[PDB]
Amino acid sequence: QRDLVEAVAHILGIRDLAAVNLDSSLADLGLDALMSVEVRQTLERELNLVLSVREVRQLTLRKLQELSSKA
Amino acid sequence: LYFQGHMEGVRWAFSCGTWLPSRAEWLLAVRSIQPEEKERIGQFVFARDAKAAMAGRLMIRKLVAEKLNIPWNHIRLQRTAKGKPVLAKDSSNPYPNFNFNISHQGDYAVLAAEPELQVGIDIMKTSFPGRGSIPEFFHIMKRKFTNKEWETIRSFKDEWTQLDMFYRNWALKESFIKAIGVGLGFELQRLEFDLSPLNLDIGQVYKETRLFLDGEEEKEWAFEESKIDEHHFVAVALRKPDQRQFTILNFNDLMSSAVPMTPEDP
Ligand SMILES: [Mg+2]
Ligand SMILES: [Mg+2]
Ligand code: NI
């Protein structure tokens, strides 16, 4: 909700994430097909944001920190 | 073509999740793949992903090099608009229907190739979902399986079995999706699999699972299901263009026909 950033980190199988450039794309962080579905369903239910596959692939974690703060 | 030689399907697995290359061996790998593919692999933040992608590429080139007898350096791999690796139209290839596909989830990169049958592959490790509980996960995934599919998935009291069945049903859907080469943009709910048999033993290829696309059986599609180990399921979807267990390769197998493609670069 507030830290969606973690939720998608966990989806990507990243934990801590202190050891992750927040500027890395979700693609670069290894976004699977399954992960893709999860992240997209999460940003729907949590942020009312339906994203293209291309959009989600290019999502930075900082770009997430931006999209949750705004509320 | 004098040097005819009847070709057969290929089923290869490489445990990249336990591949631990040295700086030197990786650099060997990295130079053995196409420039665009190098740069991409080199963009992955994690070893897990970079190694999978790398194993995938080395396996395709091995397959073409070995089965199509194109010298590795002259293998021109490309991609469809929707990202599927294909071999360049310009031949060294009197198998016009020869096609292939890889998957890499879990600890493995798998590849299927066939000379005629158009094929798709998908591997999936039964691992606890990265976020939330199983039930939560399945919820996040509701829109992707049919009620009948979900009844089968939750038909087991053990949530690991549930997860097993989920990943199986998923892999079956991906194999098909990857077979037809369409991408994420295919309403997966259109596809319903009748998972048969429910319990799969390792060391065996199951051909019994039939597919229904939009409620009509897709009788032109065979599905080969195996567990390459107790934790990975693999689905190979096979369509006619109108026995063989997977073989665990190792690094030297992947490189056996490798020639370096891109130059030295620190
Ligand atoms: Mg290549
Ligand atoms: Mg061999
Ligand atoms: Ni969690």
Short mmCIF file of C-alpha atoms and ligand atoms in Angstrom, two decimals:
data_model
loop_
_atom_site.label_atom_id
_atom_site.label_comp_id
_atom_site.label_asym_id
_atom_site.label_seq_id
_atom_site.Cartn_x
_atom_site.Cartn_y
_atom_site.Cartn_z
CA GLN A 1 0.00 0.00 0.00
CA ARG A 2 2.47 2.62 1.26
CA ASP A 3 5.42 0.33 0.38
CA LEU A 4 4.27 -1.16 -2.81
CA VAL A 5 8.00 -0.84 -3.62
CA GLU A 6 8.73 -3.80 -1.37
CA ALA A 7 5.73 -5.75 -2.66
CA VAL A 8 7.09 -5.63 -6.22
CA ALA A 9 10.59 -6.21 -4.91
CA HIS A 10 9.32 -9.38 -3.28
CA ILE A 11 7.47 -10.24 -6.47
CA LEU A 12 10.77 -9.97 -8.35
CA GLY A 13 12.22 -12.15 -5.66
CA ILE A 14 14.39 -9.31 -4.39
CA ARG A 15 14.75 -9.06 -0.58
CA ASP A 16 16.23 -6.22 1.45
CA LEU A 17 16.56 -4.23 -1.84
CA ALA A 18 18.98 -1.97 0.03
CA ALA A 19 21.37 -3.67 -2.38
CA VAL A 20 19.46 -2.59 -5.48
CA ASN A 21 19.80 0.50 -7.65
CA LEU A 22 16.30 1.93 -7.41
CA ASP A 23 16.97 3.21 -10.98
CA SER A 24 17.14 -0.33 -12.35
CA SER A 25 14.29 -1.33 -14.62
CA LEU A 26 12.00 -4.16 -13.63
CA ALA A 27 13.23 -5.91 -16.76
CA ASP A 28 16.83 -5.53 -15.60
CA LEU A 29 15.82 -6.86 -12.18
CA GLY A 30 14.59 -10.01 -13.94
CA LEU A 31 10.84 -9.53 -14.50
CA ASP A 32 9.42 -12.98 -15.48
CA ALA A 33 6.05 -13.44 -17.27
CA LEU A 34 4.52 -14.47 -13.97
CA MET A 35 6.11 -11.51 -12.17
CA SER A 36 4.73 -9.32 -14.89
CA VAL A 37 1.20 -10.48 -14.16
CA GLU A 38 1.67 -10.00 -10.46
CA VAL A 39 3.21 -6.58 -10.64
CA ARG A 40 0.46 -5.43 -12.99
CA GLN A 41 -2.29 -6.84 -10.77
CA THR A 42 -0.66 -5.19 -7.79
CA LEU A 43 -0.47 -1.76 -9.43
CA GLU A 44 -4.14 -2.14 -10.41
CA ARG A 45 -5.45 -3.08 -6.95
CA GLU A 46 -2.99 -0.86 -5.03
CA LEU A 47 -2.60 2.16 -7.28
CA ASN A 48 -5.49 1.98 -9.76
CA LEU A 49 -2.85 1.96 -12.48
CA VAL A 50 -3.19 -0.34 -15.48
CA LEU A 51 0.20 -0.42 -17.20
CA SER A 52 1.25 -1.76 -20.57
CA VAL A 53 3.68 -4.66 -20.50
CA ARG A 54 6.23 -2.25 -21.96
CA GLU A 55 5.38 0.23 -19.12
CA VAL A 56 5.82 -2.38 -16.37
CA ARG A 57 8.99 -3.72 -17.89
CA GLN A 58 10.50 -0.22 -17.86
CA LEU A 59 9.28 0.53 -14.26
CA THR A 60 12.03 1.65 -11.92
CA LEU A 61 11.61 1.13 -8.14
CA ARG A 62 12.17 4.88 -7.68
CA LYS A 63 9.42 5.40 -10.27
CA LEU A 64 7.36 3.29 -7.85
CA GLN A 65 8.39 5.37 -4.77
CA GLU A 66 7.11 8.30 -6.85
CA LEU A 67 3.82 6.57 -7.72
CA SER A 68 2.91 5.72 -4.08
CA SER A 69 3.96 9.00 -2.42
CA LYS A 70 1.55 10.79 -4.78
CA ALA A 71 -1.78 10.18 -2.99
CA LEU B 1 21.81 -32.20 -50.30
CA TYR B 2 24.09 -35.26 -50.18
CA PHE B 3 24.83 -35.04 -46.44
CA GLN B 4 21.16 -35.59 -45.55
CA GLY B 5 21.01 -37.13 -42.03
CA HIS B 6 17.55 -37.52 -40.38
CA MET B 7 17.16 -34.99 -37.50
CA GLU B 8 15.28 -35.62 -34.24
CA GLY B 9 13.77 -33.49 -31.54
CA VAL B 10 16.02 -32.01 -28.89
CA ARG B 11 15.32 -31.66 -25.19
CA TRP B 12 18.07 -30.05 -23.21
CA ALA B 13 18.26 -28.72 -19.72
CA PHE B 14 21.06 -26.78 -18.10
CA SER B 15 21.11 -26.12 -14.38
CA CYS B 16 22.18 -22.49 -14.47
CA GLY B 17 21.06 -21.98 -10.87
CA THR B 18 24.01 -24.14 -9.76
CA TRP B 19 26.33 -23.11 -12.59
CA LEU B 20 28.97 -20.99 -10.91
CA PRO B 21 31.21 -19.74 -13.72
CA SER B 22 34.54 -18.12 -13.17
CA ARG B 23 35.32 -14.64 -14.43
CA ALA B 24 37.13 -16.44 -17.27
CA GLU B 25 34.32 -18.89 -18.12
CA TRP B 26 31.69 -16.17 -18.14
CA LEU B 27 33.81 -14.03 -20.39
CA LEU B 28 34.11 -17.12 -22.63
CA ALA B 29 30.33 -17.37 -22.60
CA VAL B 30 29.78 -13.61 -23.08
CA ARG B 31 32.03 -13.55 -26.17
CA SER B 32 30.28 -16.63 -27.63
CA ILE B 33 26.93 -14.85 -28.11
CA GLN B 34 25.65 -12.14 -30.46
CA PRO B 35 26.48 -8.50 -29.75
CA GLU B 36 22.91 -7.40 -29.09
CA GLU B 37 22.46 -10.43 -26.84
CA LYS B 38 25.65 -9.68 -24.92
CA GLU B 39 24.59 -6.12 -24.16
CA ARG B 40 21.17 -7.32 -22.99
CA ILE B 41 22.45 -10.11 -20.77
CA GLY B 42 24.91 -7.54 -19.40
CA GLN B 43 22.00 -5.34 -18.38
CA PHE B 44 20.56 -7.90 -15.96
CA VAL B 45 21.19 -6.85 -12.41
CA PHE B 46 21.32 -10.44 -11.10
CA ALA B 47 23.47 -13.44 -11.86
CA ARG B 48 20.30 -15.60 -11.82
CA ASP B 49 18.84 -13.81 -14.79
CA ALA B 50 22.10 -13.23 -16.66
CA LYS B 51 23.10 -16.88 -16.35
CA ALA B 52 19.67 -18.11 -17.50
CA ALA B 53 19.63 -15.80 -20.52
CA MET B 54 23.18 -16.83 -21.23
CA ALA B 55 22.44 -20.59 -20.91
CA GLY B 56 19.45 -20.04 -23.17
CA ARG B 57 21.55 -18.45 -25.89
CA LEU B 58 24.41 -20.87 -25.68
CA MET B 59 21.91 -23.72 -25.94
CA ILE B 60 20.18 -22.35 -29.05
CA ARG B 61 23.54 -21.82 -30.77
CA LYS B 62 24.68 -25.32 -29.74
CA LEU B 63 21.46 -26.71 -31.16
CA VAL B 64 21.77 -24.92 -34.49
CA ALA B 65 25.51 -25.54 -34.62
CA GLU B 66 25.12 -29.26 -33.92
CA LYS B 67 21.79 -30.08 -35.53
CA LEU B 68 21.90 -27.65 -38.46
CA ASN B 69 25.70 -27.92 -38.85
CA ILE B 70 26.08 -24.19 -39.29
CA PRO B 71 29.39 -23.16 -37.84
CA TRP B 72 28.62 -21.32 -34.62
CA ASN B 73 30.22 -18.09 -35.84
CA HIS B 74 27.76 -18.06 -38.77
CA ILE B 75 24.59 -18.69 -36.77
CA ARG B 76 22.35 -15.70 -37.41
CA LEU B 77 19.74 -15.70 -34.64
CA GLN B 78 17.03 -13.08 -34.75
CA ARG B 79 13.74 -12.36 -33.06
CA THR B 80 10.11 -12.03 -34.12
CA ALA B 81 8.34 -8.70 -33.55
CA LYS B 82 7.09 -10.24 -30.32
CA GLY B 83 10.58 -11.30 -29.19
CA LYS B 84 10.83 -15.00 -30.10
CA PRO B 85 14.23 -16.20 -31.19
CA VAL B 86 14.21 -17.47 -34.74
CA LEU B 87 16.92 -18.53 -37.09
CA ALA B 88 17.51 -16.18 -40.01
CA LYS B 89 15.43 -16.97 -43.11
CA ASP B 90 18.65 -17.37 -45.20
CA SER B 91 19.09 -21.09 -44.72
CA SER B 92 21.94 -23.57 -44.17
CA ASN B 93 18.65 -25.22 -43.20
CA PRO B 94 16.77 -27.68 -45.42
CA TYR B 95 14.44 -28.11 -42.42
CA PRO B 96 12.06 -25.28 -43.18
CA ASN B 97 9.88 -26.21 -40.16
CA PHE B 98 12.84 -26.61 -37.76
CA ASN B 99 12.04 -24.42 -34.80
CA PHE B 100 12.92 -24.16 -31.19
CA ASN B 101 12.39 -22.32 -27.96
CA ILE B 102 13.87 -22.00 -24.53
CA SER B 103 12.63 -21.32 -21.07
CA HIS B 104 14.45 -20.32 -17.94
CA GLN B 105 12.75 -20.29 -14.62
CA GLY B 106 14.00 -21.89 -11.44
CA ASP B 107 17.43 -23.38 -11.52
CA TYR B 108 17.31 -24.43 -15.14
CA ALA B 109 17.25 -23.21 -18.69
CA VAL B 110 15.46 -25.70 -20.89
CA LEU B 111 15.29 -25.91 -24.67
CA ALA B 112 13.16 -27.91 -27.06
CA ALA B 113 13.76 -28.08 -30.80
CA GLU B 114 11.96 -30.04 -33.40
CA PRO B 115 12.49 -30.48 -37.13
CA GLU B 116 8.82 -30.29 -38.17
CA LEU B 117 6.56 -29.91 -35.13
CA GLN B 118 6.32 -26.24 -34.23
CA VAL B 119 7.16 -26.09 -30.57
CA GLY B 120 7.02 -24.05 -27.37
CA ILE B 121 8.57 -24.79 -24.00
CA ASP B 122 8.13 -23.59 -20.43
CA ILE B 123 9.81 -24.55 -17.19
CA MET B 124 8.55 -23.67 -13.75
CA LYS B 125 10.02 -24.28 -10.30
CA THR B 126 7.67 -24.95 -7.46
CA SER B 127 8.89 -22.31 -5.12
CA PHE B 128 7.01 -20.38 -2.54
CA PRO B 129 5.60 -17.26 -4.13
CA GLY B 130 7.79 -14.19 -3.73
CA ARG B 131 5.02 -12.01 -2.26
CA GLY B 132 2.17 -12.91 0.05
CA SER B 133 0.89 -16.33 0.81
CA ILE B 134 -0.14 -18.97 -1.64
CA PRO B 135 -3.78 -18.11 -1.29
CA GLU B 136 -2.96 -14.45 -1.81
CA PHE B 137 -0.78 -15.35 -4.78
CA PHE B 138 -3.56 -17.45 -6.34
CA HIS B 139 -5.84 -14.55 -5.83
CA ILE B 140 -3.49 -12.23 -7.67
CA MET B 141 -3.56 -14.84 -10.40
CA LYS B 142 -7.36 -15.46 -10.51
CA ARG B 143 -7.98 -13.89 -13.90
CA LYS B 144 -5.59 -16.38 -15.54
CA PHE B 145 -7.17 -19.79 -14.95
CA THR B 146 -10.63 -21.19 -15.44
CA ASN B 147 -12.85 -22.19 -12.56
CA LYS B 148 -12.38 -25.86 -13.50
CA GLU B 149 -8.61 -25.26 -13.53
CA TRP B 150 -8.77 -23.68 -10.07
CA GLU B 151 -11.00 -26.44 -8.67
CA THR B 152 -8.27 -28.87 -9.80
CA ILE B 153 -5.58 -26.64 -8.30
CA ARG B 154 -7.27 -26.32 -4.89
CA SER B 155 -8.38 -29.97 -5.03
CA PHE B 156 -5.28 -30.79 -2.96
CA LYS B 157 -5.13 -30.19 0.79
CA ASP B 158 -1.34 -29.55 0.61
CA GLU B 159 -0.56 -26.00 -0.54
CA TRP B 160 2.73 -27.21 -2.10
CA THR B 161 0.83 -29.62 -4.28
CA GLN B 162 -1.54 -26.73 -4.97
CA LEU B 163 1.45 -24.66 -6.01
CA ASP B 164 2.80 -27.62 -8.04
CA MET B 165 -0.47 -27.86 -9.92
CA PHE B 166 -0.60 -24.13 -10.39
CA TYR B 167 2.87 -23.97 -11.85
CA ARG B 168 2.03 -26.92 -14.03
CA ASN B 169 -1.11 -25.36 -15.34
CA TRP B 170 0.86 -22.17 -15.85
CA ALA B 171 3.67 -23.88 -17.69
CA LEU B 172 1.17 -25.61 -19.96
CA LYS B 173 -0.26 -22.18 -20.85
CA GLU B 174 3.13 -20.63 -21.51
CA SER B 175 4.31 -23.53 -23.66
CA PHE B 176 1.37 -22.96 -25.92
CA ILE B 177 1.76 -19.17 -25.83
CA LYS B 178 5.40 -19.51 -26.65
CA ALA B 179 4.67 -22.14 -29.27
CA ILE B 180 2.35 -19.70 -31.10
CA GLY B 181 4.84 -16.94 -30.32
CA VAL B 182 2.23 -14.34 -29.30
CA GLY B 183 3.54 -13.01 -25.98
CA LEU B 184 1.92 -11.85 -22.75
CA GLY B 185 -0.94 -10.35 -24.76
CA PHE B 186 -3.01 -13.54 -24.95
CA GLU B 187 -5.95 -13.84 -22.53
CA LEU B 188 -4.70 -16.91 -20.68
CA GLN B 189 -8.20 -17.58 -19.41
CA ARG B 190 -9.06 -18.62 -23.01
CA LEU B 191 -6.96 -21.72 -22.40
CA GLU B 192 -8.18 -24.53 -20.19
CA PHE B 193 -6.02 -27.60 -19.65
CA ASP B 194 -7.26 -30.93 -18.42
CA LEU B 195 -4.25 -31.87 -16.32
CA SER B 196 -3.75 -35.62 -16.70
CA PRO B 197 -2.25 -37.43 -14.84
CA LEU B 198 -2.32 -35.28 -11.70
CA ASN B 199 0.73 -36.90 -10.08
CA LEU B 200 3.85 -36.80 -12.25
CA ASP B 201 6.91 -38.90 -11.53
CA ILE B 202 10.39 -37.73 -12.47
CA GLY B 203 12.13 -39.37 -15.42
CA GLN B 204 9.07 -39.67 -17.65
CA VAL B 205 7.39 -37.64 -20.41
CA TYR B 206 3.61 -37.37 -20.06
CA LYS B 207 1.69 -36.76 -23.28
CA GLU B 208 -1.87 -37.12 -21.87
CA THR B 209 -2.79 -33.50 -20.99
CA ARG B 210 -5.22 -32.08 -23.59
CA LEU B 211 -6.03 -28.39 -24.15
CA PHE B 212 -9.26 -26.55 -24.70
CA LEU B 213 -9.01 -23.17 -26.40
CA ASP B 214 -12.23 -21.21 -25.92
CA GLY B 215 -14.10 -24.41 -24.89
CA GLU B 216 -13.27 -26.28 -28.12
CA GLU B 217 -10.54 -28.92 -27.77
CA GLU B 218 -7.35 -27.94 -29.59
CA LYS B 219 -6.88 -31.44 -30.98
CA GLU B 220 -3.96 -30.25 -33.20
CA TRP B 221 -1.84 -29.75 -30.03
CA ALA B 222 0.19 -32.27 -28.03
CA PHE B 223 1.70 -31.36 -24.71
CA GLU B 224 4.75 -33.02 -23.21
CA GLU B 225 5.03 -32.65 -19.51
CA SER B 226 7.98 -33.74 -17.49
CA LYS B 227 9.63 -32.95 -14.25
CA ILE B 228 13.29 -32.51 -15.00
CA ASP B 229 13.77 -32.75 -11.23
CA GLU B 230 11.44 -33.04 -8.25
CA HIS B 231 10.92 -29.27 -8.34
CA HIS B 232 10.81 -28.21 -11.99
CA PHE B 233 7.97 -28.85 -14.34
CA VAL B 234 8.44 -28.45 -18.07
CA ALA B 235 5.75 -28.25 -20.66
CA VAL B 236 6.58 -28.66 -24.32
CA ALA B 237 3.74 -27.67 -26.61
CA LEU B 238 3.88 -29.25 -29.99
CA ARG B 239 1.73 -28.34 -33.04
CA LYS B 240 1.97 -30.03 -36.41
CA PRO B 241 3.26 -27.33 -38.86
CA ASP B 242 0.05 -27.85 -40.86
CA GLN B 243 10.08 -41.05 -25.40
CA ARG B 244 12.85 -38.35 -25.30
CA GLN B 245 13.68 -37.26 -21.74
CA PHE B 246 15.60 -34.05 -21.17
CA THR B 247 19.40 -34.26 -21.18
CA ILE B 248 21.20 -32.23 -18.53
CA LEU B 249 24.01 -30.39 -20.29
CA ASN B 250 26.97 -28.82 -18.53
CA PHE B 251 28.97 -25.75 -19.32
CA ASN B 252 31.46 -27.46 -21.61
CA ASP B 253 28.49 -28.92 -23.46
CA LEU B 254 27.12 -25.46 -23.94
CA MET B 255 30.50 -24.28 -25.20
CA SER B 256 31.49 -27.43 -27.12
CA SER B 257 30.80 -25.75 -30.52
CA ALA B 258 31.39 -22.13 -29.37
CA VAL B 259 33.54 -19.69 -31.31
CA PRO B 260 33.89 -16.14 -30.10
CA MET B 261 31.68 -13.62 -31.90
CA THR B 262 32.34 -10.25 -30.33
CA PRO B 263 35.86 -8.89 -29.63
CA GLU B 264 37.82 -8.52 -26.36
CA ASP B 265 36.27 -5.82 -24.16
CA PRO B 266 37.15 -5.31 -20.40
MG MG C 1 23.19 -15.36 -29.64
MG MG C 2 24.38 -33.58 -27.05
NI NI C 3 5.85 -11.33 1.44
#
